[PDB]
């Protein structure tokens, strides 16, 4: 084991549902990637598990119980990536129904130039400086997700959450503003 190769023991598949993703977000690569091409929407069924005004979409895999790492990139600012439950609103129109704004999602945001940490409408700037490409580590019975900058030979830990974990927790991306993107690392 190398550093990253500790994590990657617990890699796991994830991949985003094209049955939540918000009009604005168009999926590519095998659903590996996702990218925000306001104000051009794409025509996708409506669907009761769609996102209907936040940016948003959900892996259409969850987390139960155990140790799971993956790897994302981030573009643009505006970017979140984090963890949610599958209870979310979809069709809300209030912070309680976006990533940063309730009790049972998690999830850090690039501004253009520092992460942000954010929990049930509180925020915590940080000073990491860039990462183009993020690890993402979860320890469900130990309530830990943590967010690592990942770059050829080394990792280093932008911020680590305490979570009160109950549900299942599927990733969950908050693509906000024009031309953000995120795409999920083969692994």
């Given at each position: 084991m190398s550093t990253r190769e500790q994590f990657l023991q617990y890699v796991h598949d994830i991949t985003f549902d094209p049955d939540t993703a918000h009009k604005y977000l168009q999926l590519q690569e095998e659903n590996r990637k996702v990218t925000n091409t306001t104000p051009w929407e794409h025509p996708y069924p409506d669907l009761p598990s769609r996102f209907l005004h936040w940016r948003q979409v959900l892996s259409q895999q969850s987390l139960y119980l155990h140790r799971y790492y993956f790897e994302v990139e981030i573009f643009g600012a505006g970017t979140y990536v984090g963890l949610t439950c599958?209870?979310?609103?979809?069709?809300?129109?209030?912070?309680?129904?976006?990533?940063?704004?309730?009790?049972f999602s998690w999830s850090l945001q690039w501004n253009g130039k520092e992460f942000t940490a954010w929990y049930s409408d509180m925020e915590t700037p940080l000073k990491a400086g860039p990462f183009r490409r993020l690890g993402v580590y979860i320890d469900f019975p130990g309530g830990i997700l943590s967010f690592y900058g990942v770059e050829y030979d080394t990792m280093t830990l932008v911020h680590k959450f305490a979570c009160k974990f109950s549900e299942p927790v599927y990733a969950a991306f908050w693509?906000?503003?024009?031309?953000n993107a995120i795409r999920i690392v083969d692994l």
């Amino acid at each position: 084991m190398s550093t990253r190769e500790q994590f990657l023991q617990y890699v796991h598949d994830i991949t985003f549902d094209p049955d939540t993703a918000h009009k604005y977000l168009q999926l590519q690569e095998e659903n590996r990637k996702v990218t925000n091409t306001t104000p051009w929407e794409h025509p996708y069924p409506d669907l009761p598990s769609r996102f209907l005004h936040w940016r948003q979409v959900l892996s259409q895999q969850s987390l139960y119980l155990h140790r799971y790492y993956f790897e994302v990139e981030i573009f643009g600012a505006g970017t979140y990536v984090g963890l949610t439950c599958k209870g979310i609103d979809r069709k809300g129109e209030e912070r309680n129904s976006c990533i940063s704004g309730n009790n049972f999602s998690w999830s850090l945001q690039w501004n253009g130039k520092e992460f942000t940490a954010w929990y049930s409408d509180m925020e915590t700037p940080l000073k990491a400086g860039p990462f183009r490409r993020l690890g993402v580590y979860i320890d469900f019975p130990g309530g830990i997700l943590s967010f690592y900058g990942v770059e050829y030979d080394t990792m280093t830990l932008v911020h680590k959450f305490a979570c009160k974990f109950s549900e299942p927790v599927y990733a969950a991306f908050w693509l906000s503003k024009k031309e953000n993107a995120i795409r999920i690392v083969d692994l």
